[PDB]
Amino acid sequence: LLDQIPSYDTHKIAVLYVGEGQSNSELAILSNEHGSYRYTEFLTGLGRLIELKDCQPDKVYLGGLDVCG
Amino acid sequence: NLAAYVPLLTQGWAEILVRRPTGNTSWLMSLENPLSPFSSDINNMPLQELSN
Amino acid sequence: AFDFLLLLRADSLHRLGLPNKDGVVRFSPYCVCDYMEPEGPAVRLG
Amino acid sequence: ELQTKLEDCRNMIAELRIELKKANNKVCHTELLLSQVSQKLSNSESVQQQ
Amino acid sequence: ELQTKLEDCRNMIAELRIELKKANNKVCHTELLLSQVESVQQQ
């Protein structure tokens, strides 16, 4: 169990893209599959892009994202 | 990368030698901790260490 | 006068806008922030 | 009527951006695939010499 | 009318054309893939 307490502060940060008129629609924000080009480029700067099926959650913090895809 | 991977490979190797009243014990040692990509020298960080 | 003027805004196609009676900005199709230099034909923007 | 045209064009733009997401996701996927291939080739050369 | 025609101008003239250019970018990186495309470790 201690080995499962990480040696580093793990943080999980949500990222949401709000399209036109979705400022008050949770279901519409969550339904978003694409984003504006600026939003796509903004995502690329957040960190390393890690493919989940290659990740080990003990080594790379996935925050609860499933490896299975 | 020729000047990089050998120094990266070696610098975890060590010997701890305990001299005691009854003798000396020593182990050659080699760290399992890799060099941190986030805090090593920022000139170049190739993954050839893991390749070897 | 400043309190009104400083609420002037514009968009990526340069159309100027001011808050309406509800405080929501509308952008004009006829007024643009582009400094026009003085130094059939379509509608001429201001 | 022009509002109907606007909603039609917005539907078209939504499907175009779905296509953009599909294309960019394929770009990311095959970029990671070719990155893995490059790593594999370099590792293979080093491994043969080793 | 102002809002409808202005937002339709935005869509059709900026967004639609930028998306066509992004489809061009799609085929560009697809060409990158199409042009960019053993067990010795055991021993």
Structure solved via: cryo-EM
Set of chain D residues whose Cβ sits within 8 Å of the Cβ of E38:
44
Which residue numbers in chain E precede an interruption (C–N > 2.5 Å)?
A: 37
The answer to whether A63 touches A10, Cβ cutoff 8 Å, is yes
- CA torsion D39-D42-D45-D49 (nearest 10°) is -100
Q: Tell me which residue has tokens 């639609």.
A: E16
Q: What span, in angstroms and rounded, lies between the C-alpha atoms of E10 and E3?
A: 10
Judge: E14–C26 Cβ closer than 8 Å, yes or no: no
Buried b (16+ CB within 10 A) or exposed e, D1-26: eeeeebeebbeebeebbeebeebbee
**Rg, chain D, Cα only:** 21
Q: How far apart are CA A11 and CA A17, in angstroms?
A: 20
User: What is the secondary structure of C4-23 as a DSSP string?
Assistant: HHTT-EE-TT-EEEEE-TTS
CA C32: distance to chain centroid?
5
Phi and psi, residue A68, nearest 5°:
-70, -10
Nearest residue in B to D50, CA atom: B52
Q: What angle do CA C18, C22, C27 make, to 5 degrees?
A: 30
Contact D17 A40 (CB under 8 A): no
How large is the angle between the packed helices E16-36 and D2-49, nearest 10 degrees? 20
